[PDB]
Design a protein around this ligand. Structure first.
Ligand SMILES: N[C@@H]1[C@@H](O)[C@H](O[C@@H]2O[C@H](CO)[C@@H](O[C@@H]3O[C@H](CO)[C@@H](O)[C@H](O)[C@H]3N)[C@H](O)[C@H]2N)[C@@H](CO)O[C@H]1O
Length: 132
């Protein structure tokens, strides 16, 4: 059960209309979030809507994937998280599907914080799935 499905999202940026964060959590492999281009970090987070115990994230990257990124959680109250905790990071991402597991943790928000690009574009996810 994908706890991210159709939850509210926010992003650091978007490439164009139609590439919003909601596109990464629609369960559709043919729609994607895509960030602005360039060498800045970028990110997408999901408001899970309630505290959930999570242990697994599945990323389905488009060709503009991150070689370096972290998965982070927040347990802030409200709808605007500001404190993040890294639960997993890599510097050797290889794109396509990334199936990530980590110690189960409470989380109200989950963020992909992407820091090194595989390409000279931005970063883009067809899907960002979250599992207990
Ligand atoms: N100089 C143009 C060249 O830019 C163009 O190639 C296309 O450029 C597209 C716009 O950057 C690029 O689309 C991005 O692709 C990445 C990676 O797949 C995605 O994450 C972005 O969302 C896309 N906007 C295309 O890949 C690329 N074909 C070419 C064709 O118009 O004309 C060149 O000479």
């Amino acid at each position: 059960h994908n706890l991210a499905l159709n939850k509210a999202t926010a992003t650091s940026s978007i490439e164009t209309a139609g590439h919003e964060g909601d596109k990464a959590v629609d369960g559709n492999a043919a729609t994607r979030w895509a960030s602005a281009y360039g060498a800045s970090p970028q990110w997408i987070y999901i408001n899970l809507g309630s505290t959930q115990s999570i242990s697994r994230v599945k990323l389905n990257w488009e060709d503009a994937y991150a070689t370096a990124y972290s998965i982070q959680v927040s347990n802030d109250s409200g709808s605007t998280p500001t404190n993040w905790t890294t639960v997993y990071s890599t510097t050797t991402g290889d794109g396509a599907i990334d199936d990530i597991t980590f110690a189960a943790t409470n989380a109200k928000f989950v963020r992909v914080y992407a820091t090194t690009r595989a390409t000279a574009y931005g970063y883009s996810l067809w899907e960002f799935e979250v599992y207990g």
